[PDB]
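Changelog excerpt: complex records now keep ligands as SMILES alongside chain sequences, and the structure block spans every component. Example after the change:
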Amino acid sequence: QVQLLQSGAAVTKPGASVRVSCEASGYNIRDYFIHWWRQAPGQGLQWVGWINPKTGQPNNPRQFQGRVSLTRHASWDFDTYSFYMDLKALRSDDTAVYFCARQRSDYWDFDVWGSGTQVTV
Amino acid sequence: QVHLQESGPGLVKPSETLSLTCNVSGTLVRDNYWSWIRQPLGKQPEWIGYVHDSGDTNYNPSLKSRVHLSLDKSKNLVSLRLTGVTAADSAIYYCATTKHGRRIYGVVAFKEWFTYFYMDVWGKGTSVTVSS
Amino acid sequence: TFVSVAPGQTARITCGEESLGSRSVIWYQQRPGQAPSLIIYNNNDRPSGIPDRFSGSPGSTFGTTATLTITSVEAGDEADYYCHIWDSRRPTNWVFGEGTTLIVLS
Amino acid sequence: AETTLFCASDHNVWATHACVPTDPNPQEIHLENVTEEFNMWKNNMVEQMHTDIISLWDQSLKPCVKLTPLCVTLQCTNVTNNIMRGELKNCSFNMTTELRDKKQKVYSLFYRLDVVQIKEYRLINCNTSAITQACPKVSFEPIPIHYCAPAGFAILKCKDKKFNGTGPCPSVSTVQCTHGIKPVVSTQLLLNGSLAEEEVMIRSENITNNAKNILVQFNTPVQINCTRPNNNTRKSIRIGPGQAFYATGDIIGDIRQAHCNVSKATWNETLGKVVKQLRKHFGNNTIIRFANSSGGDLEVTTHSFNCGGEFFYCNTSGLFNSTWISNNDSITLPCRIKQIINMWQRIGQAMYAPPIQGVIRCVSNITGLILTRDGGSTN
Amino acid sequence: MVEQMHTDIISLWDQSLKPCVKLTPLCVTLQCTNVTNNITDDMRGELKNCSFNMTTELRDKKQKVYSLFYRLDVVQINKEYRLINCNTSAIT
Ligand SMILES: *[C@@H]1O[C@H](CO)[C@@H](O[C@@H]2O[C@H](CO)[C@@H](O[C@@H]3O[C@H](CO[C@H]4O[C@H](CO)[C@@H](O)[C@H](O)[C@@H]4O)[C@@H](O)[C@H](O[C@H]4O[C@H](CO)[C@@H](O)[C@H](O)[C@@H]4O[C@H]4O[C@H](CO)[C@@H](O)[C@H](O)[C@@H]4O)[C@@H]3O)[C@H](O)[C@H]2NC(C)=O)[C@H](O)[C@H]1NC(C)=O
Ligand SMILES: *[C@@H]1O[C@H](CO)[C@@H](O[C@@H]2O[C@H](CO)[C@@H](O[C@@H]3O[C@H](CO[C@H]4O[C@H](CO)[C@@H](O)[C@H](O)[C@@H]4O)[C@@H](O)[C@H](O[C@H]4O[C@H](CO)[C@@H](O)[C@H](O)[C@@H]4O)[C@@H]3O)[C@H](O)[C@H]2NC(C)=O)[C@H](O)[C@H]1NC(C)=O
Ligand SMILES: *[C@@H]1O[C@H](CO)[C@@H](O[C@@H]2O[C@H](CO)[C@@H](O[C@@H]3O[C@H](CO)[C@@H](O)[C@H](O[C@H]4O[C@H](CO)[C@@H](O)[C@H](O)[C@@H]4O)[C@@H]3O)[C@H](O)[C@H]2NC(C)=O)[C@H](O)[C@H]1NC(C)=O
Ligand SMILES: *[C@@H]1O[C@H](CO)[C@@H](O[C@@H]2O[C@H](CO)[C@@H](O)[C@H](O)[C@H]2NC(C)=O)[C@H](O)[C@H]1NC(C)=O
Ligand SMILES: *[C@@H]1O[C@H](CO)[C@@H](O[C@@H]2O[C@H](CO)[C@@H](O)[C@H](O)[C@H]2NC(C)=O)[C@H](O)[C@H]1NC(C)=O
Ligand SMILES: *[C@@H]1O[C@H](CO)[C@@H](O[C@@H]2O[C@H](CO)[C@@H](O)[C@H](O)[C@H]2NC(C)=O)[C@H](O)[C@H]1NC(C)=O
Ligand SMILES: *[C@@H]1O[C@H](CO)[C@@H](O[C@@H]2O[C@H](CO)[C@@H](O)[C@H](O)[C@H]2NC(C)=O)[C@H](O)[C@H]1NC(C)=O
Ligand SMILES: *[C@@H]1O[C@H](CO)[C@@H](O[C@@H]2O[C@H](CO)[C@@H](O)[C@H](O)[C@H]2NC(C)=O)[C@H](O)[C@H]1NC(C)=O
Ligand SMILES: *[C@@H]1O[C@H](CO)[C@@H](O)[C@H](O)[C@H]1NC(C)=O
Ligand SMILES: *[C@@H]1O[C@H](CO)[C@@H](O)[C@H](O)[C@H]1NC(C)=O
Ligand SMILES: *[C@@H]1O[C@H](CO)[C@@H](O)[C@H](O)[C@H]1NC(C)=O
Ligand SMILES: *[C@@H]1O[C@H](CO)[C@@H](O)[C@H](O)[C@H]1NC(C)=O
Ligand SMILES: *[C@@H]1O[C@H](CO)[C@@H](O)[C@H](O)[C@H]1NC(C)=O
Ligand SMILES: *[C@@H]1O[C@H](CO)[C@@H](O)[C@H](O)[C@H]1NC(C)=O
Ligand SMILES: *[C@@H]1O[C@H](CO)[C@@H](O)[C@H](O)[C@H]1NC(C)=O
Ligand SMILES: *[C@@H]1O[C@H](CO)[C@@H](O)[C@H](O)[C@H]1NC(C)=O
Ligand SMILES: *[C@@H]1O[C@H](CO)[C@@H](O)[C@H](O)[C@H]1NC(C)=O
Ligand SMILES: *[C@@H]1O[C@H](CO)[C@@H](O)[C@H](O)[C@H]1NC(C)=O
């Protein structure tokens, strides 16, 4: 039962910050990366960045650099893994559905995705 | 040469502000660090803060809000106002001059140093007493 | 404290607590009925005009009390001695050290 | 094929007892007209070495004292100092005396990374794991080990220089076993390793992929020199019958921050070679930046390693801060020491590295880097 | 053969001592008097009647119990004693 349960939708004013949770369970979370994607209304998908669940190391592009903080929290006995994505300075262009997929193997084959969190600004 | 002359009331009541005024001859006030030292009779001296331009002042934590130092560049004078004096304040006062330094002991970029002051030359003396 | 030493002999003055860090001791000297006067700063660096007879223990040593050596003492050095201490691992001491009275037998 | 190999080691955590010593002279046979397809990413020797190193760590840590009573409430005042940041904490606590019915109020000097608040603090690992003190006599100095194949197997070495990590190797030799691998446990910079032959070598499993790290191998070493200038005197506290705990009792003066220096004149033009070899892959016109660190755990944001028995965590934000365009001063890296170590990314088995008396110094060789690209970068 | 025999004997001793119980609670403060033996002058203290609190099946409870310990087995800390090993090692 590979589950990537996300949090509820949030509405936030410009200049404030938001956090999106991606509570993960049902597999070896440490083995596979977690890639955050954002999809604007109507437009195609876009890459927010990946996080390694072992070392907590993120990797964001130049566009999202300095404004996205990808963190992970490991529960006791490694049963659940709450993956948080924090956006610092939201703008009008930041409204989107945020998904958090898992990278199963080196093909970047995202087989499990979160339900998606609608962030509106 | 540097000459320091201090003049004050001589006798001040308790809870009444004391104004001790020091005149320097030999160098300009803006070019040196000015210090005040109060020595109780039969005891050690006690540094009660120093004053300069650009707001470089640190006073004694005991006499934090009591003693205040001011400078007069045109007259070449330095004034001290001590508020709320008590019987323990009756002491000899000297108006001296500090030349700072830097005792470095580390990497410097990590702020592993401290600045130390010392009385290069001395004043004359003013044994201000308090009578209730 | 009181210390008495004959002329022409070394006198050792200890003032303040034990060392704890990189310490800078400034040794003053107050004559009777006179203002204090600098004789040593930075534990060895005498100011201009002061005699070179005086010396001080270096601040690089840890756990040792500050020591002022006065070799070949004369009548002029019969006076008080207050040491101002600047330790890196101690906040600023706005009160001078416990004075020591050097008394010459003459 | 894959097979288990043994050491050839010439007190340490990397025990030389339960595997054979070295041959007096290596036997190297140059196989002429042989072109074998190597692939270091699917190499099983790496996995066997990782498992062996973990096993040696476990067998070294196993017959030594468990610090079970230390997870208690700690009255932690700041250590005597004038100051910005109180890194060292003077923590007092009730500890079990060798008699079970008696207690002793003792104190220690912990680090800020080892204690979390609840003035009442507690050790960082009380929530997640049990703790085992490392043995004071046992040293963490890396020692060379050569992994040698059993009978019926052979080890092929690629003597060809300029060798990419994957693909055919025109110059193959067979060796009985390897050189001194010297297992240094470090992040963000490879220390004490092979120094290449011709030019800086960039190796990654897929260059296009970001998710996979980039291993850079240097020509000449970059000398890095550390100091923990604090004294950090050690004192023994008998926490039970035959069980002793080594605490930082006091510090002789100048509480100073630990640091490792790199030369600026060497690290510059070392990064010059690195950006030249990287522009060899990403085109001859792209500007190549180096940035601080993306983020993550403390072991990854900081160049973490073991110097002289103490675990350093150097910032290295001044090293990797450069922009490169196509056309005796030292970089001082402030490091943070830590005693509660969770090695091999394992939760459940922590470790208390004891204090080392006196001052400690690194003089080590940076012989490589680990990097990760930033992703994105469409055109 | 001597070295191998010695190593085998020590390992047999350790293997026999492994599954047995650990007496870490026994390192406590013991009130020791003399066992009733008239007054034998010297060699009177060779057996000491020592009382101590011991743990029970329930961790929250203790019990006052007594036992006869030899003089060589104990060391004084006038009546407070402890087992001689309590600073050097642990007993199985
Ligand atoms: C990584 O790279 C950095 C940068 O290069 C480097 O930082 C350096 O750290 C050292 C310590 O490791 C610092 O050295 C101190 O420097 C001061 C200042 O020395 C200068 O100025 C004096 C004149 O005031 C000159 O004579 C001198 O040549 C220098 O120009 C000194 O105060 C220090 O020495 C005293 O303190 C030590 C600690 O107690 C004592 O052991 C020593 O004997 C000295 O005490 C004596 O002198 C005192 C004078 O005030 C006196 O009061 C005492 O009684 C006693 O007689 C000390 O040497 C240096 O400042 C840093 N340099 C820079 C450029 O930042 C790191 O070390 C390096 N790390 C590695 C691993 O390489
Ligand atoms: C023990 O620790 C204390 C506390 O940290 C140190 O005292 C400090 O000493 C430094 C260095 O002299 C002082 O900094 C100086 O202050 C001036 C500004 O002061 C204002 O701001 C501070 C707080 O920021 C207030 O406390 C103060 O009242 C004022 O409002 C600046 O003018 C100074 O810069 C100039 O001087 C230095 C050296 O003289 C030069 O390097 C500079 O370039 C420049 O010329 C300077 O920043 C600081 O204010 C002191 N703090 C306090 C609380 O008094 C002790 O030095 C230290 N002692 C030992 C023995 O280790
Ligand atoms: C990369 O390799 C270099 C060498 O190629 C290596 O430098 C070595 O570091 C060690 C560890 O700090 C140094 O050994 C120490 O040196 C001094 C002087 O002899 C002593 O204080 C030490 O002895 C004490 O510590 C030992 C360890 O617990 C105890 O066994 C011993 O009984 C003492 O208590 C110790 O010998 C060594 O001098 C250097 N240099 C060499 C070998 O040339 C460096 O550390 C390596 N880098 C990494 C990250 O591993
Ligand atoms: C055990 O305790 C640590 C702290 O000692 C917990 O880590 C904290 O997690 C909380 C979660 O809300 C964060 O606010 C803190 O930022 C974390 N720690 C620190 C040191 O800043 C850890 O999650 C706990 N482990 C459990 C409950 O399994
Ligand atoms: C850590 O704190 C302890 C608190 O006890 C300090 O130990 C005291 O040090 C003072 C120094 O003047 C002595 O008078 C006391 O007797 C000491 N108490 C005990 C119980 O030993 C200790 O010095 C502190 N250490 C540091 C490095 O700050
Ligand atoms: C990235 O480098 C910058 C400095 O170039 C560091 O960012 C600072 O971090 C501190 C500590 O969290 C903050 O108080 C500052 O506000 C930050 N400055 C800026 C300009 O953002 C950062 O620490 C480096 N990253 C790592 C992992 O070391
Ligand atoms: C690593 O070093 C960098 C560079 O010194 C630190 O970034 C500075 O942090 C201070 C506060 O500690 C800020 O005021 C500066 O603005 C930062 N930026 C600079 C100098 O460019 C960084 O904090 C250090 N990292 C950690 C984790 O301590
Ligand atoms: C060892 O001492 C214990 C007391 O600590 C003795 O036990 C008592 O013996 C008397 C004998 O008259 C009984 O009446 C008590 O009820 C016993 N009290 C207890 C068990 O708490 C014991 O006899 C002594 N053993 C010797 C001298 O061999
Ligand atoms: C102790 O250190 C903490 C953390 O830096 C600081 O907030 C506090 O003011 C310090 N207390 C004293 C008495 O120095
Ligand atoms: C140690 O135990 C005593 C028991 O009365 C308690 O009052 C004290 O606070 C404890 N000290 C610590 C935890 O440092
Ligand atoms: C290794 O890199 C070199 C230099 O770019 C390249 O020519 C070679 O094909 C690479 N190896 C493989 C197996 O692709
Ligand atoms: C590192 O230390 C060695 C040995 O003391 C010295 O020769 C070298 O110059 C140092 N290098 C630095 C500080 O970069
Ligand atoms: C490093 O060298 C390059 C030229 O190769 C120069 O542009 C750059 O400023 C240097 N950086 C340093 C010394 O930090
Ligand atoms: C990065 O390098 C530039 C140029 O030397 C310098 O101004 C800047 O402060 C450096 N950043 C850090 C964090 O050291
Ligand atoms: C550290 O302290 C010891 C105390 O015995 C002293 O001998 C040693 O010199 C100190 N270290 C340094 C570098 O001064
Ligand atoms: C660093 O590299 C030089 C040159 O290869 C070598 O001679 C030296 O032993 C190395 N030092 C180490 C590994 O500490
Ligand atoms: C009996 O026990 C006491 C302690 O209670 C001991 O000091 C003494 O030597 C023993 N012998 C006699 C004869 O009292
Ligand atoms: C045993 O426990 C009781 C409980 O009240 C205590 O008074 C007594 O001193 C203890 N005796 C020993 C030998 O520990």
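Chain E has one helix and five strands. Chains E and A do not touch (no CB pair under 8 Å).
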